[PDB]
Write a protein that binds this ligand. Sequence first.
Ligand SMILES: Nc1nc(Nc2ccc(S(N)(=O)=O)cc2)nn1C(=O)c1c(F)cccc1F
Ligand SMILES: O=C(O)c1cc(-c2cccc(Br)c2)nc2c(F)cccc12
Length: 257
Amino acid sequence: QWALEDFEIGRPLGKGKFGNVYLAREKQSKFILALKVLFKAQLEKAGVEHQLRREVEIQSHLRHPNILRLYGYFHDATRVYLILEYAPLGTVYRELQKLSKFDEQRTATYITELANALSYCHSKRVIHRDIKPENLLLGSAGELKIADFGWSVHAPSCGTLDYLPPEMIEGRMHDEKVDLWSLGVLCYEFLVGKPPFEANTYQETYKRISRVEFTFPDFVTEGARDLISRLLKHNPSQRPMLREVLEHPWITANSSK
Ligand SMILES: Nc1nc(Nc2ccc(S(N)(=O)=O)cc2)nn1C(=O)c1c(F)cccc1F
Ligand SMILES: O=C(O)c1cc(-c2cccc(Br)c2)nc2c(F)cccc12
């Protein structure tokens, strides 16, 4: 079905970890795509083979304009290859380093696209549990696309803690409401330029998250402060639904259609 000899490899798009993502073209069709090349050696050592097979399983079945498509896969003597959709405008992470922060218009648009992709995800019981600017790509029309379903499982079932909710950092039972916390973290970071629980240590970030310790800078408007505060609740049941988020007055007044 799939072999390396079917693709013309180009420029690197990102580096790992388990390996790199390269720009590639399918010889037979001239289809431009992105080839994630993971090394079997590193994947063992970490014991992620079950998780990756789980990711690929989930990601290949999903169909949404705000979820990055996985077209297929293959493997050789030492590497596993993922055939991904190529997002031409790069990462939201890189965009945020460039602009430092985003306006209300851009933030509400990204939050709408993210909530939509998450509603679709939850309607198939899939919980992402890893939404972060490094895992968000931008399509040719600048539309947001969720990219890494590595740490995703079926609800209700590590690096920097910045986007994880209290129930997850404490090891407790967590469900769909975990992704609603991530949304609040992202909405804050888009407007401020840094996540609300950021710190110089993991130990301190853990304290900040468990205690829900965030302050808004002066430029954060009332509407943004209301949506973020509602999302950043310790009790998961106290967080709103995705329907409520899409219908928030700050979202409806700044988003797009
Ligand atoms: N599948 C995919 N498409 C893109 N598009 C893209 C376009 C330009 C750039 S840039 N400005 O040169 O760094 C980067 C990516 N990335 N991508 C990935 O899997 C990917 C990812 F999710 C995270 C990090 C790196 C990646 F490579
Ligand atoms: O035994 C292998 O060759 C092997 C295969 C895969 C793999 C195959 C299809 C889809 C996906 Br996702 C992964 N992964 C491996 C791995 F992660 C480590 C060692 C061997 C394999």
